[PDB]
């Protein structure tokens, strides 16, 4: 475009789309690790509950 | 609008905003979920700490 | 710009980019906290291994 403002807004939209995709990917990764943490903590509580006298 | 280029820009802007809102919600929920996981791990160690 | 549509698009594009930055920072914080939670759950199981 011959319009500087139009080129800038196009750049902003593209940069925003890419960043959003990356942020969602990272959020899902965090949720996966969060689940791993919860599962391992439950494992510890189960081992404690199943201890022999 | 009959300006084709302006229409494409409108579409790109709308998609970008929609995705940013989607990612903002995802990130907010994930931070909260991570705190819950931190609390769960802390509670497991607490049970080990308080056992006689 | 005397063109209202162009101004509105310029604003919306900048706002989307700012919101994406916010989401990036929050996602990064969540990954860090989740990792710390994983490490602490591992600490609990290690303590049990030594009993
Ligand atoms: Zn240009
Ligand atoms: Zn049109
Ligand atoms: Zn203007």
């Amino acid at each position: 475009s011959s319009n500087a403002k139009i080129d800038q807004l196009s750049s902003d939209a593209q940069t925003a789309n890419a960043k959003a995709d990356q942020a969602s990917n990272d959020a899902n990764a965090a949720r996966s690790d969060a689940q791993a943490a919860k599962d391992d903590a439950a494992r510890a509580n189960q081992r404690l509950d199943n201890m022999a006298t």
Side-chain angles (χ1 to χ4, degrees), chain A residues 20 26 37-38 46:
Chain A
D26 280 336
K38 293 174 193 174
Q46 180 162 283

mmCIF file of all heavy atoms in Angstrom, chain A residues 20 26 37-38 46:
data_model
loop_
_atom_site.group_PDB
_atom_site.id
_atom_site.type_symbol
_atom_site.label_atom_id
_atom_site.label_comp_id
_atom_site.label_asym_id
_atom_site.label_seq_id
_atom_site.Cartn_x
_atom_site.Cartn_y
_atom_site.Cartn_z
ATOM 1 N N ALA A 20 -0.768 -14.835 19.330
ATOM 2 C CA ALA A 20 -1.916 -15.476 19.970
ATOM 3 C C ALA A 20 -1.816 -16.993 19.842
ATOM 4 O O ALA A 20 -2.093 -17.724 20.799
ATOM 5 C CB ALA A 20 -3.216 -14.974 19.355
ATOM 6 N N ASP A 26 1.273 -22.480 24.443
ATOM 7 C CA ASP A 26 1.911 -22.494 25.759
ATOM 8 C C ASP A 26 0.924 -22.712 26.894
ATOM 9 O O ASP A 26 1.266 -23.333 27.902
ATOM 10 C CB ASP A 26 2.663 -21.195 25.994
ATOM 11 C CG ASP A 26 4.009 -21.178 25.321
ATOM 12 O OD1 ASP A 26 4.586 -22.263 25.056
ATOM 13 O OD2 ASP A 26 4.495 -20.061 25.072
ATOM 14 N N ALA A 37 1.431 -32.733 37.438
ATOM 15 C CA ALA A 37 1.674 -32.423 38.848
ATOM 16 C C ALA A 37 0.554 -32.973 39.740
ATOM 17 O O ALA A 37 0.817 -33.565 40.791
ATOM 18 C CB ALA A 37 1.796 -30.907 39.036
ATOM 19 N N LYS A 38 -0.694 -32.770 39.327
ATOM 20 C CA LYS A 38 -1.834 -33.250 40.102
ATOM 21 C C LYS A 38 -1.821 -34.771 40.205
ATOM 22 O O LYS A 38 -2.087 -35.324 41.274
ATOM 23 C CB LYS A 38 -3.158 -32.802 39.468
ATOM 24 C CG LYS A 38 -3.419 -31.306 39.495
ATOM 25 C CD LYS A 38 -4.686 -31.005 38.708
ATOM 26 C CE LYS A 38 -4.848 -29.529 38.414
ATOM 27 N NZ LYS A 38 -6.013 -29.288 37.510
ATOM 28 N N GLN A 46 -1.899 -41.525 47.695
ATOM 29 C CA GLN A 46 -2.339 -42.916 47.627
ATOM 30 C C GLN A 46 -1.308 -43.843 48.281
ATOM 31 O O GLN A 46 -1.676 -44.796 48.971
ATOM 32 C CB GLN A 46 -2.593 -43.323 46.171
ATOM 33 C CG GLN A 46 -3.067 -44.762 45.998
ATOM 34 C CD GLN A 46 -3.720 -45.006 44.648
ATOM 35 O OE1 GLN A 46 -4.876 -44.630 44.425
ATOM 36 N NE2 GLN A 46 -2.980 -45.627 43.735
#
